[PDB]
Amino acid sequence: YPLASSTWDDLEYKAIQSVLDSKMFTMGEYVKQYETQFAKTFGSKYAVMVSSGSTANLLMIAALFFTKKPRLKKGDEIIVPAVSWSTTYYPLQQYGLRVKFVDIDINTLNIDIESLKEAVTDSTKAILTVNLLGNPNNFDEINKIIGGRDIILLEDNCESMGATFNNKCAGTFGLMGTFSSFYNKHIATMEGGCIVTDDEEIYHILLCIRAHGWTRNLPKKNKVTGVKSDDQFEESFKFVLPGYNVRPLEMSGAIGIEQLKKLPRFISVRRKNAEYFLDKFKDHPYLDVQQETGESSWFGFSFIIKKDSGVIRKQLVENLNSAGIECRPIVTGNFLKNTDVLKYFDYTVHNNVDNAEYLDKNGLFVGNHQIELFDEIDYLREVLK
């Protein structure tokens, strides 16, 4: 039982072969297409490909500072959840925003709705939601706590590509949504990330900031510079926004196109595996599993040691490993235990983070893949007895 498995076939391999014979390796044809199908795939107007889910988060944030009428500015308050990957947080700190952490809900593993409604205020300029483990946030309920102030909605959808709510694609709820194409995820392009949006102005700020803050990937009339000059001796060396060089590589673009085709069955295998998993673990003596929302893409399986259950986490761990079972902390556990990097943040905690503290000491995680795991899952129910 591995936390991970390959998602490639010969198709990806000749996809690489193909980018070779072209002898055009820098972000190009492949990307553009991948970016087109990506959007077609999840129901957005615009998608943008970058070097990683991480850089996609960097860009998602940086962007809101370059809108003609800026949407964020330093010191602004943005709310986020206590549980998520490191790079969900960094950008906030890098852009000098004031972070308000909010305890997650122990059943869904996502951000606590009651806790949220009470933490959102006048100052709250944005809400950075995170779809944890394929599980989407209940967006209807988030949209009510907001309704209908001028408060930004974004989603780090890096763990839940293919998840859905009300039959709306996760990642497509935010003003911007991010995805990650890193090895261990739903699809793998070696490294890769994607930002979608339906917002024209955001779209263009992205194009610009992903590559040097120049104008070459911008259209003749754009939402940033207005009208590009025809004199390439000048228009080609014009810098309009402090960006980065976050270009994805043609190869990833080409691999992505492919992965996007296997996606559906990828997602089918996973939900059928989860179905089963839930059956086998339904009424467990000492562990709770994730409470699903919408239709999850089931990144992995989380377990949470039942309160007053006398079981000791590092005992189960031993057991699983000794049984050839790969397991790990859910995501990264309580992000707030990271006292050191925190000293660099301008953050605060709403109420408490008791749930995350509890998930930090009592939670474990085992993977889900896009190949059947009935057997293994069967073996898992035995070890955990």
Ligand X SMILES: O=C(O)CCC(=O)C(=O)O
Q: Does 179 bind ligand X (CB under 6 A)?
A: no
Sign of the Cα pseudo-torsion (87, 88, 90, 95, in order): positive
Select from 67, 90, 216, 217 the one that contacts a second copy (CB under 8 A): 90
3-state secondary structure of 385: coil
Q: Does 178 bind a second copy (CB under 8 A)?
A: no
Phi first, then psi: what are they for 257, rounded to 5°? -50, -45
Among 34, 299, 47, CA closest to 194: 47
Q: Report how far Cα 46 is from the mean position of its chain's Cα atoms.
A: 17
Calpha distance 301→103 (Å, rounded):
20
Calpha distance 172→162 (Å, rounded):
11
* Closest CB 64 distance from ligand X, rounded Å: 23
CB 108 within 8 A of CB 115: no
Is residue 114 marked as binding? no
Select from 174, 243, 300, 367 the one that contacts a second copy (CB under 8 A): 243
Which ranges of the chain would DSSP assign to H, the alpha helix? 10-22, 29-42, 53-66, 86-94, 113-119, 139-146, 200-210, 232-235, 250-281, 313-322, 339-342, 354-362, 374-383
Among a second copy, ligand X, none, residue 251 binds (CB under 5-8 Å by kind): a second copy
Among 97, 139, 134, 96, CA closest to 116: 139
Q: Does 245 bind ligand X (CB under 6 A)?
A: yes
Per rule CB under 8 A, count of chain residues that contact a second copy = 57
Q: Does 338 bind a second copy (CB under 8 A)?
A: yes
Q: Does 191 bind a second copy (CB under 8 A)?
A: yes
Is residue 372 marked as binding? yes
* Closest CB 340 distance from a second copy, rounded Å: 5
Q: Does 182 bind ligand X (CB under 6 A)?
A: yes
Residues 3-62 that bind a second copy (CB under 8 A): 6, 13, 16, 20, 23, 25-26, 51-55, 58
Among 61, 84, 59, 263, CA closest to 157: 84
Per rule CB under 6 A, count of chain residues that contact ligand X = 5
Footprint on this chain of ligand X (rule: CB under 6 A): 85, 182, 184, 245, 331
Residues that bind a second copy (CB under 8 A): 6, 13, 16, 20, 23, 25-26, 51-55, 58, 85-87, 89-90, 93-94, 182-183, 190-191, 212-214, 225, 233-234, 236-247, 249-251, 314, 317, 328-329, 332-333, 335, 338, 340-341, 344-345
